[model samples]
Target chain A: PPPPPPPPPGADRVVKAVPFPPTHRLTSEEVFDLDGIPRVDVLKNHLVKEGRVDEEIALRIINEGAAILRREKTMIEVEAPITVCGDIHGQFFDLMKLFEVGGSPANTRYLFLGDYVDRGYFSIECVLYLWVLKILYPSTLFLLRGNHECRHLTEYFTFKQECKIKYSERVYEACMEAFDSLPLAALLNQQFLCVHGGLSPEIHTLDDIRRLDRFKEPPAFGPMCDLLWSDPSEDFGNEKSQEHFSHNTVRGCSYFYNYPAVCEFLQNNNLLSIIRAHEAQDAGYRMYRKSQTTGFPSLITIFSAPNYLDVYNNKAAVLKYENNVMNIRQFNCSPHPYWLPNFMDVFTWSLPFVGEKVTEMLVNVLSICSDDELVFSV
Target chain B: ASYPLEMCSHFDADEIKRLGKRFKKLDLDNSGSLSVEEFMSLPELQQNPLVQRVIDIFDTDGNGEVDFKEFIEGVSQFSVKGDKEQKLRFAFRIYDMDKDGYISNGELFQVLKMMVGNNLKDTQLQQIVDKTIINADKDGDGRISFEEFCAVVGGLDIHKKMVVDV
Candidate 1:
């Protein structure tokens, strides 16, 4: 492959360049803004730099007992474009391709809808790099939580191992910190609501989301399950009905939605549009063909992690907005180069932070060895 | 490629012995105690077949780490009838020869392998290897000490509660 493109000019040193795409760009001033909430804002900034999180902060965020960012009441600019992404699954190269195809932070507003790491290779890279970007450009880019963000899935898949493989156990702690701090939803233009999973039967207003004690872990019951597990369905099923994806082996699928149900839900909620990113989208995005079925054309979805680790080389898109008008641009990602090891390697190296020994081995070997060692180790 | 024998199924005796030595180091508090973190710290624990099979199942906290509570629950909380808990408890007790409530890293791996590897498939065995190298061993020292193992495993409950609670 062409020698990896050199880092964009001034990749390391932040030039005083005015970033483009008014929405995604964050000047150093804005990134450094510690307005009202000094502690968390400082911590958030520190998180971006240190990449390590205090265990207490990590624990608090995971519990979903409360959150650092509140919904509705917070001052979120409206009518601005918002982009939603889906399960990245850590195809790191593809994410770069996505930046090439879609707008990177320099010229776009983004909302990543979770599943940033796992399954594919480079999940650790995916999460850490994205988090760094989040730090570098917090204003334009946003990340919401997904099912895979949890620890069990990482252990089950490759995350735990990948962490051990790439960074040491310490950096893996940063990954956990990053996961715990991820948000669950974003309100765009005050007209549209966006999140990783679909709407919960219990949700009626943005205020409801604001009121939710979302930071709590295993929000299995009311709004917690609603945010994490809820899906779109053809029928506006009973409020008591429980339909969630992620945990129960058979139940979780993309939020199945029907046209009428979406319309009813959106209309009742007084929302103009609903943007989400969860299900696999081949074209980087999906707009419910203007209510061809639901008449709820206002609903939209975007999956930023294109090329989808090669299983689905579908093009993806990002939703852009300015002047209160919205646009979706289709994009494609690079192809997957490495298949997940079908069988475990005797040495055990993974990219998603699960394998501790492998990571330690790599660190030691990497520290003293040469590029040739990597080839030999492989 | 499939090997004639499951890499996980066949534990090289020397590797096991080597693991036994590493395990001794992982158990901090020399309490001879091995919690989830302590067990995960051992280099041998990182790739062992048994830990991988049941890693997710036992990692209830989901931090990809294991704790003493998690360990006890995994080994003894299966709801089996008469003496199952006692049997495993005694087994853990024997395995934990130091009588320190916790298994040393070697003891942890030995007990875990005896517990999970007995019936695990090759793929399942691989998970433990993956978990060990990536998830369990945090220091990147190519091996995990007992205290680190304890710290790592003990941290999962915190990890688990964070994601789903929302």
Candidate 2:
């Protein structure tokens, strides 16, 4: 793998350079730099610095990235020696931390299995970072759509709200339009099937998935939504008692696949295992033991968003494959800076306030508010 | 009327500013206040039964929306920092859904469902309500007056159950 370009001249001290860079590494003040892609460093550090992004550039990235996704297949076929990550759920700093750990997108191949938005405070920045990277490394970086990528999920969750606050509702519409065109699955080495969710009963072969009418909001039921919603059925070891396909009670949508169905799935597709990411794993990744049929874990669930939802007390992980050797890596959550919380950044204060004046002001404010509470007490 | 200096005398200046931003996040249309739809965006009270009623009480002027000034007042009374009487008045308001200044068994029955998700027989629900009125209806009016209601909850930790960190 080629090393990342060293940081631009005099760039390190000027920007809040992401702590560790690949080869002391590596967007957009210029839009397109040496290789015709946005200066990755400027655009990459966009959120970390000003926390304000240009709406004009946002629209262009959304349109250009969607155009790229529309030209790709419903099911992406790719080679291995790649890094596979799970749901990011919109944690901007953690994603930056993730890059620091997994090497820069410039050098390593990345296949993110969906869920690029929702729940976290910075979905706009988080998703935009990947889209910018996709524009730069279209072939090297592969993105598959997750359940949370849909419009319905966005409105129900945090993504839609984040958009309106950061940009305009029109920007959100363009994003939803872009979401409709994302590929739903990826095939690595024709051995492992990597998808955001699990298999659908409607699918019989890899072609069944590739030919799916995937360019729209996922339907309520059918091959598309199922592949983006299902989970490995809870009853793992008991093949005889396992119901092949049953309604997932917790999710309220999609079916859960038992061992028998998954075993049959891989057998029919001539695949070794299905590596998926839809559930939060306490250990960041879950491995189902040897399939009686193939002696390999039938299904692997890898979740890359650490300390999920900020309350799960769970670690996040990624699955890396180099020369067919599976490597599971884990990372803890990173402490992201917080705003004083008006419209998310009403601009009164930041990471500790006016740098210091407001910090003392808060000391006085708390004292005064505390004293007033005793007004009627006596 | 919404001067910062005066507002600071009543609230933590930082917290008021915090609520100002929170109010904007809900004011999706950026109309300088939160519409009923925007208010329900809390995802906090959205699932609770009294959520709609919550906005009504906070909307104060009956404008069908909550501006930052009106929003902060409601937030203050619900916050743990609120004085005992402030929390008491809010609780009374929550239970007195009819706005009748007293909590009838019928009113209590409705809020009981809000707390317990109420999956119970009418008889089961009424039994709890009867015991509640019997305990708090010190004047024998077949309902709970504000003072009588306060006497009953006075011993309970209102901070834990009723006061939110808001």
Off by over 4 Å in 2: A1-29, A34-36, A339-378, B1-166
DockQ of each: 0.02, 0.01
* Clashes found in each candidate (C-alpha, N, C closer than 3 A): 84, 7
User: Which digits, one per residue and each the tens of the lDDT, describe model 2 over residues B12-76?
Assistant: 76666665655555568888877777644544445445555566667767777877777777667
Q: Across residues A83-156, which tens digit of lDDT does each residue of candidate 1 receive? A: 55566777776666666655657567766777778877767546645655554555677777787777666767
**Interface RMSD for all numbered candidates:** 20.2, 26.9
lDDT of 2 by residue, A38-73 (tens): 766877665665245667777778878898998999
Worst 10 residues of 1 chain B by lDDT: B157-166
lDDT of 2 at A377: 6
CA shift of A139, model 2, Å: 0.8
lDDT of 1: 0.49
What does TM-score give for chain A of every model? 0.64, 0.82
Q: Which model scores highest in lDDT?
A: 2
